[PDB]
Amino acid sequence: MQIFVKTLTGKTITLEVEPSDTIENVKAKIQDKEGIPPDQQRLIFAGKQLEDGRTLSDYNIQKESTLHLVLRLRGG
Amino acid sequence: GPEVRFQQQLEQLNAMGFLNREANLQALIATGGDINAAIERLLGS
Known part of the structure; x- marks a missing residue:
């Protein structure tokens, strides 16, 4: 199956996944x-x-689903 | 003025599910409009 990972939003990417795979492996x-x-x-x-x-x-x-990914730079 | 940055960043936060303008404003005003140091505050700090 396949989901729309929103990396801080703006950048939306498809990611291919199995439902039984671990969120650790994601x-x-x-x-x-x-x-x-x-x-x-x-x-x-x-x-x-x-x-x-x-x-x-x-x-x-499931599928075509819009999970957000927050990411944190150590300043800049 | 630069208030347009802060305003549009409240909506970038709205998309993630931070459904409140005032908490999002205080989280950005605490930094000067750096959004990654604002997001961690909305997570609970």
Whole structure:
């Protein structure tokens, strides 16, 4: 299945995923494709944090769905 | 004036689910309009 990751919004990208795959592996796919450590990342589902819930199947996240990705630079 | 930056940044925050203009204003005024130091405040600091 496939979702619309909104990286701070403005940049909307499709990401291919399986529902049973871990949100740990989703953080790793973001980290290794975009070159950014997971501590800087936060996943925002309509103001709710995605945390301790395990997979896209656990939350019933599905397809063409608009998950926000907050990322934090250590100043600049 | 630069108030247009702050205003449009309240809407970039609205898209993420920060559905309040006044908290978003105070979070940006606390920095000078740096939005990444504003977002962490809206997360709880």
